[PDB]
Write a protein that binds this ligand. Structure first.
Ligand SMILES: Nc1ncnc2c1ncn2[C@@H]1O[C@H](COP(=O)(O)OP(=O)(O)O)[C@@H](O)[C@H]1O
Ligand SMILES: Nc1ncnc2c1ncn2[C@@H]1O[C@H](COP(=O)(O)OP(=O)(O)O)[C@@H](O)[C@H]1O
Lengths: 353, 97, 604, 145
């Protein structure tokens, strides 16, 4: 039904939406429904939750405006089943486009303009970003891409507006997308035997333009391997884990078709905001982290591979409105930010070593 | 989307991966192909769905094929002791599937 | 008597007469038009020995005057427009010709784009907006003939009509272009006395910013009239208000018909307005009341306004005052001096930023893209046809080659905001060499050798060569686009990423409180600063830039590189612009001090 | 299925299933149009109801000035004394549509194609032509099943 889908709805759905949102364990019951098949990797399992909500949108005078939502890489070894996770985000999200390219398949990835042979007339051809306006775009093989449609991708993650300057038309259009890339290293764990950069061919400013870099490892463990193997045999047949999923649905883990409508309703109704003591908390954390990069920077006699910028502070300040926009409340609280200190702090432990 | 020289109306002409659903396709000599084809073979093994967007049409056709390939080594029959990803001139993501 | 018209026509004429005499601004507007043409006629008939005829009527007043006349116009306009035009010609003839109207609105939920136009909205009054393509040529139409006779010596006379006349219908009578009256005599025609009235048709597509995701566009076409020829170049964004007429006999005349569905449609008239866009078309129509120029005169005479308007472009960006000073000096732009029987000398300023990532270098250029007028942004590519036209024309009426302007021709008197300046290949950099000093674009492709005009101003923001190494090794190729491209640019701001603790604080509370002097006055300051008045340079400022320039050669040729005479010319340009800021007429030593300090911080 | 459509199915209710390639431009037919003789100065009106008989047409304008079929005396008198000894004639086809008191409707012309899964293996896929009435216009984006 997209584009021009249905917004307003009935009365009892408001009732049951106000009945789901009052549970104290909303974060757990959302972080157990995303991977009923993927074992392990609970951090990414947490990070998809704060990505499907979207941040705040501020149109403060002047003509400038800020953005939402955050952007996530998932670089790591094969066997992470990150591609199946991207198929899951394709199934959940209200609008979502899955392009594994290089452009795929007979459809390009950016906003190309093709003149109609009849009438000799310009029109917007399509692509990936323009069809998916107001949601999530998932990409495979972000390192192995053509590099002529790359400048537009490194523009549409920052100011949300793709520009066209061809021979006839000079319009500037909107794209409120939220990129979720997933690249692949060469030789695997030798990346973390090297410096944590040294994967993308050209430069590492790309790794500073993103927000939450995740790095997946693999360590052989016997009970872990028997657990994943016996788990996958339980996944196969005769879908006993799906029967168990039905007895989960009798108790918790609401639905897919309830989850989609819940994401739409929680997205376009509320608009959250913080409290200034949380702001002095976040200043009191970020200044100490930057000083720690100053002392680690001065002692280790070289420059760092993954820098820290104020975009990292802007990502930290958007995570709290993601989680408040889950909790449906207009204001923010202290533990309500400290959980994001734990999570982004786990991504800094992903970042440094 | 291309025209048809017998009948002048435009036709949505599906590919062979569109055409061979619930069957077996036959592709040979990988080393003489374009990137435009290689993105389509990578597409059909990725999520079993070819989507097209030119010109005035926006669909997702379904394709659940089964490919039997027929490769060809580089120069000599078996170049060195080196393994297959080193021996053939292909790439790793088409060898993963 | 034409047809001795009914008392219904008398009712409409009398009622609209009462409305037009109720509110009395329109009488004063008619008086203004009539007096202006009168005194112009006195100048053209007295020394040596133009304005059209339409009144803009707003639909605010008729809703509080008559519901019947209001909802009468917006349903059946072929019964209500010719009476009101008749009464207005009655008033204009009685106070001292067509005298058409406008109907500026405020329209009645007929605000519809040409995607949703047809067909139960037909033969009503409809407002349509969109892009204009593919505007045809202007041709003159004949109305009245005049013939001289031989040998009896009497002129003659004949009329002509069409289907695109006044909005009713009429039983058509064709009429042969006459020759050989009774009795048989040759009728040699004439020109100069026979009238002619112009005619032009344009077509309208729906907006691409409003269009669906990807689908084919659907379009209609508009006929224009006498006083509406040549308003809108192709590429504009245009509001049209008109009448959705449907003329023609649709194949029901002759049997066994082809052209399966007839009844071709169009729009007559009436009031083409061009409107502002985000990236094409001027916005210099902004109003200036006497209150506003009185306030500009009130703030005009202070001594801190350059330091007030410095900190005005940054509501939410910390630091970087000297960049803001450079951007205001770009928006004022200096003055343009064309010589006599030579070549002109360039007026504006060109600015390149370069520095580390995450330094708000891309956030700034959107703000310059909003506050200015005629901003056009080109990122990356590029080829083909940014600086050229590419000449792809396949004109259907005859074999001929036209031009279709790119981004450089179209941004005249404007600002071009280029991002990622290193990613450009050198083949387009040839065209940037052609633009940024020669100020002309010569195209001799297939073709037609031409020399059009384009005098834009350029802002770019390039990355370093490798890493953020802006100070580490040397300034000698941390940028590496040598070397004439470094000399064409006036200023080279070099932005670093120093780490501190106080800087972390001052950034911190700024970014934190941002999540929770005013610009629509500032652009009204800008345009009045631009049209009035140009300054002249005076004796008090020569010796400062002479001593300063010999200083910069004899010592900055011992420190850095390069220095040409173009630095001297840009000193003169920044002096003139800072003279324009304070709304003065002459040039003081203060200007040379300020521009001197800006070039010191820019180079050193 | 679209492959087997004999001539035995001419003018019956037959449903099917395919893929819509591309639509067309919104047209305008007429439903109520009021006419006038350009010689006789007569007035009539015509309503038409069912409007898809594409190269028929559904109706035409009448081809005589139609006043000579009159059940009155003095109307036949003035229509007799249009001339002096011979009868008058508007004819040939004299009528003129007045465009300022009519009403119009819509018509679409889609185009339909069989699904490319079965069984075009040797062949080329074959196609038909649709037609829509009033409220069935502008409902289907080209691409759907
Ligand atoms: N923890 C897991 N739970 C379930 N399936 C898994 C798990 N780990 C890996 N898989 C399997 O791995 C495959 C996905 O491969 P993947 O690593 O996504 O390829 P790539 O990331 O190189 O595109 C899937 O078929 C999936 O069944
Ligand atoms: N001095 C500053 N004050 C406030 N915000 C800043 C500052 N410097 C950088 N930023 C942040 O940097 C972002 C813009 O990055 P930018 O440097 O423009 O992109 P790029 O380097 O890729 O061209 C903005 O979101 C803005 O919030």
């Amino acid at each position: 039904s997209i584009w021009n889908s249905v917004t307003m709805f009935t009365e009892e759905e408001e009732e049951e939406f106000l009945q789901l949102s009052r549970n104290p364990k909303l974060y757990e019951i959302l972080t157990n429904s995303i991977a009923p098949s993927i074992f392990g990797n609970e951090d990414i399992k947490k990070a998809i939750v704060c990505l499907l909500m979207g941040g705040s949108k501020k149109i403060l005078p002047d003509g400038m405006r800020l953005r939402g939502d955050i952007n996530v890489l998932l670089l790591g070894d094969p066997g992470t089943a990150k591609s199946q996770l991207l198929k899951f985000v394709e199934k959940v999200s209200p609008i979502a486009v899955y392009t594994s390219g290089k452009g795929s398949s007979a459809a390009g990835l950016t906003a190309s303009v093709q003149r109609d042979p009849m009438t000799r007339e310009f029109y917007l051809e399509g692509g990936a970003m323009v069809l998916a306006d107001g949601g999530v775009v998932c990409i495979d093989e972000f390192d192995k891409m053509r590099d002529e449609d790359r400048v537009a991708i490194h523009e549409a993650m920052e100011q949300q507006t793709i520009s066209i300057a061809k021979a006839g038309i000079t319009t500037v259009l909107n794209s409120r997308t939220s990129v979720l890339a997933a690249a692949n290293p060469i030789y695997g764990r030798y990346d973390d035997l090297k410096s944590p950069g040294d994967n993308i061919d050209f430069q590492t400013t790309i790794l500073s333009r993103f927000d939450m870099i995740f790095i997946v490892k693999d360590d052989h463990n016997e009970e872990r391997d028997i657990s994943i193997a016996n788990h996958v045999i339980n996944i196969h047949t005769g879908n006993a884990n799906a029967m168990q999923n039905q007895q989960e649905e009798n108790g918790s883990e609401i639905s897919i078709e309830k989850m989609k409508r819940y994401i739409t309703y929680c997205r376009l109704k509320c608009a959250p905001r913080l409290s200034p003591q949380a702001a002095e908390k976040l200043s009191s954390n970020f200044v100490t982290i930057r000083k720690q990069l100053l002392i680690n920077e001065l002692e280790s006699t070289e420059r760092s591979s993954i820098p820290i910028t104020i975009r990292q502070l802007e990502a930290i300040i958007r995570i709290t409105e993601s989680l408040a926009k889950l909790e449906l409340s207009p204001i923010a609280q202290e533990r309500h930010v400290d959980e994001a200190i734990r999570l982004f702090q786990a991504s800094t432990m992903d970042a440094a070593s | 989307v291309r025209k048809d020289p017998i009948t002048k109306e435009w036709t949505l002409e599906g590919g062979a991966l569109v055409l061979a659903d619930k069957g077996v396709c036959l592709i040979d000599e990988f080393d003489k192909m374009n990137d435009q084809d290689r993105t389509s073979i990578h597409e059909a093994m990725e999520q079993q769905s070819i989507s097209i967007s030119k010109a005035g049409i926006v669909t997702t056709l379904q394709a659940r094929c089964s490919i039997i390939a027929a490769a060809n080594p580089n120069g000599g029959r078996y170049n060195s002791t080196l393994p297959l990803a080193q021996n053939v001139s292909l790439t790793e993501p088409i060898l993963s599937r | 008597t034409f047809f001795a018209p009914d008392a219904v026509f008398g009712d409409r004429v009398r009622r609209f007469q009462e409305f037009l005499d109720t509110f009395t601004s329109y009488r004063d507007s008619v008086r203004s038009i009539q007096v202006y043409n009168s005194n112009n006629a006195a100048n053209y008939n007295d020394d040596q020995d133009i304005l059209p005829h339409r009144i803009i009527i707003s639909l605010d007043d008729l809703r509080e005057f008559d519901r019947s006349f209001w909802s009468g116009i917006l349903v059946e306009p072929a019964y209500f427009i010719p009476p009101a035009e008749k009464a207005l010609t009655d008033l204009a003839d009685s106070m001292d010709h067509p005298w058409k109207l406008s109907f500026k609105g405020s329209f009645g939920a007929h605000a519809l784009s040409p995607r949703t136009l047809t067909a139960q909205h037909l033969n009503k009054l409809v407002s349509v907006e969109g892009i204009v393509t593919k505007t045809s040529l202007v041709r003159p139409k004949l109305i009245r003939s005049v013939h001289y006779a031989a040998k009896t010596g009497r002129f003659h006379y004949r009329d002509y009509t069409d289907a695109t006349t006044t909005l009713t219908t009429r039983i058509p009578t064709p009429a042969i272009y006459p020759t050989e009256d009774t009795e048989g005599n040759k009728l040699t025609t004439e020109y100069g006395y026979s009238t002619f009235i112009d005619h032009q048709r344009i077509t309208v597509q729906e907006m691409p910013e409003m269009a669906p995701a990807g689908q084919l566009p659907r379009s209609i076409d508009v006929i224009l009239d006498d006083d509406l020829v040549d308003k809108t170049k192709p590429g504009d964004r245009v509001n049209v208000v008109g009448v959705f007429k449907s003329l023609g006999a649709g194949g029901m005349n002759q049997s066994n018909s082809n052209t399966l569905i007839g009844f071709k449609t169009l729009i007559l008239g009436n009031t083409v307005y061009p409107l502002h866009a985000r990236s094409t078309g001027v916005a210099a129509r902004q109003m200036l009341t006497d209150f506003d120029i009185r306030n500009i005169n009130k703030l005009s005479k202070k001594k801190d306004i350059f330091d007030i308007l410095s900190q005005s472009l940054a509501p939410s960006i910390y630091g970087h005052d000297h960049i803001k000073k450079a951007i205001l000096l770009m928006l004022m732009g200096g003055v343009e001096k064309n010589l006599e029987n030579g070549s002109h000398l360039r007026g504006d300023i060109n600015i390149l930023m370069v520095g580390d990532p995450s330094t708000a270098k891309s956030q700034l250029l959107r703000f310059v893209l909003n506050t200015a007028s005629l901003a056009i942004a080109t990122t990356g590519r590029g080829s083909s046809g940014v600086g050229l036209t590419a000449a792809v024309t396949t004109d259907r009426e005859t074999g001929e080659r036209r031009l279709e302007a790119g981004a450089m021709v179209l941004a005249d008197r404007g600002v071009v905001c280029i991002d990622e300046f290193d990613k450009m290949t050198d083949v387009d950099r040839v065209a940037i060499h052609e633009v940024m000093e020669q100020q002309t674009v010569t195209i001799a492709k297939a073709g037609i050798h031409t020399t059009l005009n384009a005098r834009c101003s350029v802002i770019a923001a390039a990355n370093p060569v490798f890493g953020q190494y802006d100070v580490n090794r040397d300034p000698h190729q941390n940028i590496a686009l040598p070397d004439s491209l470094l000399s064409r640019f006036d200023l080279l701001f070099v932005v670093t990423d120093d780490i501190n603790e106080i800087r972390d604080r001052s950034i911190s509370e700024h970014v934190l409180r941002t999540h929770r002097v005013t610009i629509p006055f500032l652009r009204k300051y800008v345009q009045y600063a631009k049209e009035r008045v140009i300054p002249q340079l005076t004796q008090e400022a020569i010796n400062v830039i002479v001593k300063n320039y010999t200083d910069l050669r004899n010592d900055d040729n011992t420190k850095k590189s390069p220095i040409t005479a173009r630095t001297l010319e840009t000193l003169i340009r920044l002096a003139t612009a800072h003279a324009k800021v304070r709304l003065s007429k002459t040039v003081n030593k203060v200007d040379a001090k300020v521009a001197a300090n800006l070039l010191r911080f820019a180079l050193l | 299925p679209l492959r087997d459509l004999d001539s035995e199915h001419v003018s019956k209710i037959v449903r099917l299933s395919g893929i819509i390639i591309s639509t067309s431009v919104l047209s305008s037919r007429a439903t109520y149009l009021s006419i006038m003789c350009r010689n006789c100065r007569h007035t009539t009106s015509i309503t038409i109801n069912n409007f898809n008989s594409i190269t028929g047409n559904t109706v035409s304008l009448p081809r005589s000035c139609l006043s000579t079929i009159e059940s009155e005396s003095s109307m036949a008198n003035e229509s007799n004394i249009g001339d002096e000894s011979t009868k008058k004639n508007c004819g040939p086809d004299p009528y003129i549509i007045i465009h300022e008191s009519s009403k119009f409707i819509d018509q679409q012309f889609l185009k339909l194609q069989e699904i490319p899964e079965l069984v075009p293996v040797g062949e080329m896929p074959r196609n038909l032509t649709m037609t829509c009435d009033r409220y069935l216009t502008n409902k289907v984006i080209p691409g759907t099943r």
